[PDB]
Ligand binder design. Structure first.
Ligand SMILES: Nc1nc2c([nH]c(=O)n2[C@@H]2O[C@H](COP(=O)(O)OP(=O)(O)OP(=O)(O)O)[C@@H](O)[C@H]2O)c(=O)[nH]1
Ligand SMILES: [Mn+2]
Ligand SMILES: [Mn+2]
Ligand SMILES: [Mn+2]
Ligand SMILES: [Mn+2]
Ligand SMILES: [Mn+2]
Ligand SMILES: [Mn+2]
Ligand SMILES: [Mn+2]
Ligand SMILES: [Mn+2]
Ligand code: NA
Length: 327
DNA sequence: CGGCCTACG
DNA sequence: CGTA
DNA sequence: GCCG
């Protein structure tokens, strides 16, 4: 029996149904490109259910009773099982609309609404966007300028180098402050599109004003290509390489230690795992979860947590380590 | 039928 | 809107 | 698209 919410089941990084899940995730992506966030969610959830199964699905029988599998997702799986391809998926794959929306939305600073407008205006290539620079925000100009580098997978060697320079800047800005790797690398991923760090200090309140101080120190060592009181920064770093450098996306977030378990849980993801966990919290337990805390709206109180385990327990969920949150 | 995670920049 |  |  398979629970309905992704936060109720372990999802490891390596699973047994990548072909089927990849196909459903193409339909999810395409649904988002057409502005159907509900269809996107169902296709994402169905793909995630397959990631949590212990074995390869070989027969449509094995889908009976699984949550988020109805007529549409079941037919996709049945065609892939019978023919090795799903006609709808292939039609989406090969479409100019899908290919261009994927290309544009993968730019840092460009989402579906922006990409769709550009599509409707006839634009199709990165060079098209470069030829009309005034249509671009500062953030989009940075994303486009560094697009090549940002399309190169970030590896663990890059993470370790980046954590060192971030720890050095953090320690110069505030003694005793700490840096925790989050995001997909904390979940055990070998690669990523960025590196995510969570910064705090053991003495509540000492972290006030920290992120501007850290950013100024990084910028003075020549490490910042793009950034921007604030507590989150979605940056592009100039990461030194042997004889050169490459641009890397880095997310920095500062939290007071009282919020650290909630920030750690939120920023560790996966993104689907966290939306599911917040949905579960509100719809099943009547509690409101975010990366700052867990709120009881009836008593008007916040749950004091010392650990991620505490949060799972307050929500009545079996604890899942980060490596099992790869929903 | 309506809901679908979340808050900051 | 973007982070996504 | 699926579900309460
Ligand atoms: N703009 C952009 N987004 C990308 C790229 N690659 C990539 O995975 N993403 C987005 O980032 C997600 C996975 O990246 P990741 O390895 O950092 O995973 P993560 O859980 O740490 O994601 P997060 O840092 O957003 O929390 C994907 O779901 C996708 O939407 C890319 O080249 N460009
Ligand atoms: Mn397995
Ligand atoms: Mn259908
Ligand atoms: Mn057939
Ligand atoms: Mn990441
Ligand atoms: Mn990130
Ligand atoms: Mn805050
Ligand atoms: Mn409806
Ligand atoms: Mn619908
Ligand atoms: Na984007």
């Amino acid at each position: 029996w398979m629970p309905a919410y992704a936060c109720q089941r372990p999802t490891p990084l390596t699973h047994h149904n990548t072909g089927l899940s990849e196909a459903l995730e193409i339909l999810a992506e395409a649904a988002g490109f057409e502005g159907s966030e509900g269809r996107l969610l169902t296709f994402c959830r169905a793909a995630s259910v397959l990631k949590a199964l212990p074995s390869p699905v070989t027969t449509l029988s094995q889908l009976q009773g699984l949550p988020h599998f109805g007529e549409h997702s079941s037919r996709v799986v049945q065609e892939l099982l019978e023919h090795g391809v799903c006609e709808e998926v292939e039609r989406v794959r090969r479409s100019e609309r899908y290919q261009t929306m994927k290309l544009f939305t993968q730019i840092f600073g460009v989402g579906v609404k922006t990409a769709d407008r550009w599509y409707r205006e006839g634009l199709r290539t990165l060079d098209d966007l470069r030829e009309q620079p005034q249509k671009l925000t500062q953030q989009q100009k940075a994303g486009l300028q560094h697009h090549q580098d940002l399309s190169t997978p970030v590896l663990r060697s890059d993470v370790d180098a980046l954590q060192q320079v971030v720890e050095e800047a953090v320690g110069q800005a505030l003694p005793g402050a700490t840096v925790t790797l989050t995001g997909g690398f904390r979940r055990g991923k070998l690669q990523g599109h960025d590196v995510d760090f969570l910064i705090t200090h053991p003495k509540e309140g000492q972290e006030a004003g920290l992120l501007p101080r850290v950013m100024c120190r990084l910028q003075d060592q020549g490490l910042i290509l793009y950034h921007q009181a604030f507590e989150r920064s979605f940056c592009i770093f100039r990461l030194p390489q042997p004889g050169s450098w490459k641009a890397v996306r880095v997310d920095l977030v500062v939290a007071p230690v009282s919020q650290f378990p909630f920030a750690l849980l939120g920023w560790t993801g996966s993104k689907l795992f966290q939306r599911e966990l917040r949905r579960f919290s509100r719809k099943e337990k009547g509690l409101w979860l975010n990366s700052h805390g867990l709120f009881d709206p009836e008593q008007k109180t916040f749950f004091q947590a010392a650990s991620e385990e505490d949060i799972f327990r307050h929500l009545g969920l079996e604890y899942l380590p980060p490596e099992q949150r790869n929903a």
